From a paper:
In contrast, FoxA2, also a pioneer factor that binds to canonical forkhead motifs, displayed the opposite behavior and selected only for DNAs with TT sites, even showing a decrease in its melting temperature in the presence of the GG site. Also, EMSA assays indicated that FoxA2 binds weakly to the TGTGGATT site whereas it interacts with high affinity with its forkhead site. To explore the impact of the protein-DNA interactions on the DNA topology, we compared the DNA shapes of the FoxH1 complexes with other FOX structures available in the PDB and with the pair of complexes we determined here for FoxA2 using Curves+ 43. Small differences were detected at the major groove, whereas the minor grooves were found to be slightly wider in the FoxH1 complexes than in other FOX structures. A similar absence of interaction between Asn and the G-C pair could account for the DNA binding preferences of FoxA2. The structural information we gathered for the DNA binding specificities of FoxA2 and FoxH1 FH domains is compatible with the hypothesis whereby FoxA proteins substitutes for FoxH1 preferentially at TT sites, with FoxH1 remaining bound to GK sites even when the concentration of this protein is low.
Numbering used by the authors: 152 to 238
Amino acid sequence: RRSYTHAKPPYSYISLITMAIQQSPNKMLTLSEIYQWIMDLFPFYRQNQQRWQNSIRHSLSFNDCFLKVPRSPDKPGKGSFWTLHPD
DNA sequence: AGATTGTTTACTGAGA
DNA sequence: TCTCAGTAAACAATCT
Ligand SMILES: [K+]
């Protein structure tokens, strides 16, 4: 068995996150759902996950276009949801 | 206790 | 030359 090389798809981390959220049924995703959507669709991101996931977490917090949404206390779980800022 | 999630600072290189 | 994107890492809050 051998490994194969994929080229990075042409999207910034902001675009990848935005597309992930826009296509989801509730217009909001957890962090791991975002990782999973990106890996499901772009096989380039099935490698170096320690790196690019650090960068996704950084971009979610650093950029004002991403908004954290708390879980309702009646539905507790790991992490919060991420949605797009209403502007 | 350990791992994940989230925030923050500091670089650094791409590109205009 | 200057902005922004992506990397690295420290550290804390909050999960398992
Ligand atoms: K944010």
